Design an enzyme around this catalytic site. Structure first.
Site, short mmCIF file in Angstrom:
data_model
loop_
_atom_site.label_atom_id
_atom_site.label_comp_id
_atom_site.label_asym_id
_atom_site.label_seq_id
_atom_site.Cartn_x
_atom_site.Cartn_y
_atom_site.Cartn_z
N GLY A 92 -7.92 -6.93 -0.95
CA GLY A 92 -7.87 -8.16 -1.70
C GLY A 92 -6.79 -8.02 -2.77
N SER A 125 -6.50 -1.11 2.24
CA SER A 125 -5.45 -1.83 1.52
C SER A 125 -5.66 -1.72 0.01
CB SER A 125 -5.39 -3.27 1.99
OG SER A 125 -4.06 -3.75 1.87
N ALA A 126 -6.09 -2.80 -0.66
CA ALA A 126 -6.33 -2.69 -2.10
C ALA A 126 -7.34 -1.58 -2.40
CB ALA A 126 -6.82 -4.02 -2.68
N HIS A 162 0.51 -1.94 3.65
CA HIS A 162 1.25 -3.04 4.28
C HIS A 162 2.75 -2.79 4.26
CE1 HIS A 162 -2.14 -5.99 4.56
NE2 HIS A 162 -2.50 -5.56 3.37
N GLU A 198 1.33 -1.36 8.40
CA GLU A 198 0.13 -1.91 9.01
C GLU A 198 -0.13 -1.24 10.35
OE1 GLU A 198 0.18 -6.37 7.05
OE2 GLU A 198 0.54 -6.10 9.20
#
Ligand code: ASP
Ligand code: ASP
Ligand code: CA
Ligand code: CA
Lengths: 240, 240
Positions: A92, A125-126, A162, A198
């Site tokens: 997020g 990710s985050a 990413h 990714e």
């Protein structure tokens, strides 16, 4: 030390285009958590609608055979972390996520549970950003202001999730991802930056680190040429 | 009030692909500064090599007929701002720029010179970000930590420079620029976000604001559909 205590699965991104949530890494999640973990504690702070986020993560983890508790439904998040069998921090907005970890007094609690109690940690990710020394190399907009960019420090280096190769067709004059990281590496005493494209992710087991997935990782070292690394690559040298 | 005091030229990006530094906006710089401004005070803090940056900006402004002083060569930057005839803050890393404005005690000094003394202000990109209420909508990596995201507040709304339409050819799963701003607009009490595409810029004269350039601006209002605006558009309604 970390040798038999640290267990991390640091995913760059949750979803391949056209695929399902956590589908591309679901086998690695299963191996990582194993058969004796019953329930996963989810941290949804990176997204605004925590209720919908927890519902999405619960559907997937229940399909994988795990119950899912969301820390935002706990009346004492610190106590929830202290009792967690496994911790998953989803992606997020990284600034929103980190500020919320600080606001709920979870930085120290999560650090202890992972690094001293050996509880497995999954980041996407985050959630991978906040697993690192700091969020200096997030791609996200600073929509809120955390008290510090320092994060969980489950690893001592930075990660750029990413990760994106420059676009040769593009006339856009904004910075490339590499140009942004190069500027980071002009600041004092900055650590290595691992660019996880990714589709690739990092498995950390004690003082061992391994690149997994189907895409390459670009490693940025201060003052050096960036190097490219294939799935299976040994990144243990980034750990102390 | 601001009516006859505020003069801003807020450029999204310094250079068109294949073109020269500030070439695409050089006529507007000339009209904005006018014939009676002799010297421009440059702030190079957004880039690491301040000496080379000042050399580049000096070459262009001297070609345009203006002398150029760089605040990083002043022994008292505050005094340099207090004596400036015009202020130009160039682009680079917005976090590095804002932290350096705070570190050199220039936020209040620049605010007074522009908003109370009527000194014209030019921003390019990161220099446009720090002209706004805050840098919450910069695209830049947080390579350093400013004490606050609050900036000069020469205008009360946010700007997203280098604004980028989503890429339909792309399978990248990272957030689109619009998706990032939408998340900002989930946070409490956030102001409008003006997305200046590369090639367009905002002229502010008192309580009047006008879009200039050759590209469109995308305006993001909290809870509303984004709207698109052609060069010449009146944005005065964003000002108080
Ligand atoms: N916002 C990204 C994190 C990043 O790109 O830094 C995510 O969680 O998907
Ligand atoms: N780094 C950009 C500013 C931004 O995109 O927010 C520039 O100054 O060119
Ligand atoms: Ca995710
Ligand atoms: Ca610029």
């Amino acid at each position: 030390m970390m040798t038999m205590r640290r267990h991390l699965l640091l995913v760059s991104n949750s979803t391949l285009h056209g695929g399902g949530y956590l589908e591309h890494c679901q086998e690695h999640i299963l191996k990582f958590l194993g058969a004796q973990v019953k329930r996963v504690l989810f941290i949804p702070y990176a997204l605004h609608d925590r209720d919908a986020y927890a519902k999405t993560a619960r559907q997937k983890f229940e399909a994988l055979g795990y119950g899912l508790d969301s820390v935002h439904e706990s009346p004492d998040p610190v106590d929830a972390v202290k009792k967690a069998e496994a911790i998953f921090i989803g992606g997020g907005n990284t600034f929103r996520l980190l500020k919320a970890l600080y606001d709920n007094d979870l930085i120290a609690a999560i650090r202890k549970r992972v690094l001293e109690d050996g509880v497995p940690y999954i980041g996407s990710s985050a959630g991978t950003n906040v697993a690192t020394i700091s969020i200096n190399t997030t791609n996200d907009m600073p929509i809120v202001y955390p008290p510090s960019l320092k994060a969980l420090e489950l690893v001592p280096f930075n990660i750029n999730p990413h990760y994106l190769d420059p676009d040769g067709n593009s006339k856009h004059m904004g910075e490339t991802r590499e140009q942004r990281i190069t500027q980071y590496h002009e600041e004092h005493d900055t650590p290595p930056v691992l660019g996880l494209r990714e589709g690739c992710f990092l498995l950390v087991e004690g003082d061992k680190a391994t690149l997994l997935g189907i895409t390459r990782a670009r490693l940025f070292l201060r003052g050096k040429n960036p190097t490219e690394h294939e799935p299976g690559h040994d990144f243990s040298f980034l750990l102390g």
